[PDB]
Amino acid sequence: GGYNVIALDREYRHALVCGPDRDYLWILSRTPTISDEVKQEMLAVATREGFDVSKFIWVQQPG
Amino acid sequence: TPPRGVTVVNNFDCKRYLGTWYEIARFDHRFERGLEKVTATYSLRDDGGLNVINKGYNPDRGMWQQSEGKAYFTGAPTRAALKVSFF
DSSP states (O other): OEEEEEEEOTTSSEEEEEOSSTTOEEEEESSSOOOHHHHHHHHHHHHHTTOOGGGEEEOOOOO | OOOTTOOOOSSOOHHHHOEEEEEEEEEOOTTTTTOEEEEEEEEEOTTSOEEEEEEEEETTTTEEEEEEEEEEESSOTTSOEEEEEEO
């Protein structure tokens, strides 16, 4: 399966990763939680690139 | 091949991407469904690919579990497009 970093911040602290089609998408962070600002940005980029963000499951993390 | 029309990071610095990432969110597939506290850890192989370790807590088993993969760039390593296979 394809693994593509479609967006990444300059500090390599937050990444948006997709698989071989728009049914595969991940939000990755160097930290177990992210802020509302980072959330909205990632979601905005996802929607701009034609991903349906209603498909996201918010993974439980310590935090 | 990446999906038609999506961006791919094209000045990728593979060395700064190495180490541990927390999975904040995912589209749900069978392979990951039900797993919590999911991390992805990347390390550089000698052959220039990446080793991938995906770890998560499975509350049904009460156990941490992990799956190991090998990733290769499909072109320039400054282009963040790879393909991963799991063993």
